[PDB]
Structure formats: structure tokens, C-alpha cells
């Protein structure tokens, strides 16, 4: 999930 677990994980980054 290289372009997707720190995607919902980007808003609060």
C-alpha cells in the first residue's frame, strides 16, 4: 500500500 496507508494518514500529517 506504498501510495495509500499515508494517505488517510495525510489530512493530520
Same mark, same amino acid.
Given at each position: 500500500? !506504498?501510495?495509500?496507508?499515508?494517505?488517510?494518514? !495525510?489530512? !493530520?500529517?
Amino acid at each position: 500500500a !506504498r501510495h495509500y496507508k499515508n494517505l488517510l494518514e !495525510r489530512q !493530520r500529517y
